[PDB]
Amino acid sequence: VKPNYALKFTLAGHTKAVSSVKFSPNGEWLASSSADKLIKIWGAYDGKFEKTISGHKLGISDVAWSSDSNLLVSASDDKTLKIWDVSSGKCLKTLKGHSNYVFCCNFNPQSNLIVSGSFDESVRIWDVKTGKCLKTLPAHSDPVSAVHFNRDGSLIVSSSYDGLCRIWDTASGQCLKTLIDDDNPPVSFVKFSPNGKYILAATLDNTLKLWDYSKGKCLKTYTGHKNEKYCIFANFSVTGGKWIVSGSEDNLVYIWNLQTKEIVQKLQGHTDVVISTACHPTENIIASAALENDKTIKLWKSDC
């Protein structure tokens, strides 16, 4: 069985490269971040533009939703992150600590904490309520490409250009595991699987790897796409069949059969690097975003 993702809408508004698209946990909204210093809110089902969220002094590399779908955190080149109230568009807090561009960000399931990764080579844990940095992890020895909390917020996985993925204890800040690939290509993306048992890692050698991080073993490899120059978001599509969704430097959205590792679909549409893809929480909806020469976000729908 293969999905039949087809282009439903194209969202246009951003004036510079789109860096990140994320669906609100309630399925209602799609949030985008861009090099144009803006956050944009769109309808997840119709692609209808909702509002523009501004305040960052430089471009944004990532955006993430809180569990109740009320707040957003954004990661900026201005060296800060910002907590936003979605309904008002107001900046609740400006998180300051990093000494270089903030690349990635995420709320924990409870949404009382924020995890960020930066070009300054560290991982930071911030208090949502106060905007205070609770912990500074000396995570890596090169830029931090991704940060993700697991299912219960007990662990953090981080990735870096230094070639490693690391598993951290949220409470202690202690590094619990360092993943070694039997090679060192820069790790450009990482995330826990929905059940927190596996980690999906992207490397700058056109490869996606599904690791059992506890046992430190690679269980699945996904290739066939282009990824050597950008930190492209990858996903677990679990609404229908089980797929691996990723952007690619050839302007296509690649979809793989999770078990067989076979490419099941290649979505054409975009005219520049597909830097970001996101999967809708309850519906078979993919949101993809492209770089400078394109600047559009696309909504794709499948029957399975």
């Binding site: 860096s19 861009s34 471009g59 080149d77 770089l291």
Partner: peptide
């Protein structure tokens, strides 16, 4: 503009 929108060295 955004670090993520920029190619690796």
């Amino acid at each position: 503009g955004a670090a993520r929108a920029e190619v690796h060295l």
